[PDB]
Structure 1
Amino acid sequence: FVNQHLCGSHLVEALYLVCGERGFFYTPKA
């Protein structure tokens, strides 16, 4: 489900799901 254009909450939900308990960092600007 990751091989598409993922924007906004959509992208964050993909990080959330794939990263699991590791967590992630979301830096839209850098």
Structure 2
Amino acid sequence: FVNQHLCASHLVEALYLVCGERGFFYTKPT
């Protein structure tokens, strides 16, 4: 796991990996 900036879908994947069961919210509002 690179410790850099995460702008792409890679950020949502990484949050999902560390949270395990989607205990987070937010997506681009459009």
TM-score (norm. length: structure 2): 0.51
How many percent of aligned residue pairs carry the same amino acid?
90
Structure with more contact order per residue of length (Cα contacts < 8 Å, sep ≥ 6): 1
Displacement over 3 Å in runs of 4+: none
Any gaps of 5 or more consecutive residues in structure 1?
Answer: none
- Count residues with an aligned counterpart: 29
Any gaps of 5 or more consecutive residues in structure 2?
Answer: none
TM-score (norm. length: structure 1): 0.51
Structure of larger gyration radius:
2
Return the structure number with greater helix share.
1
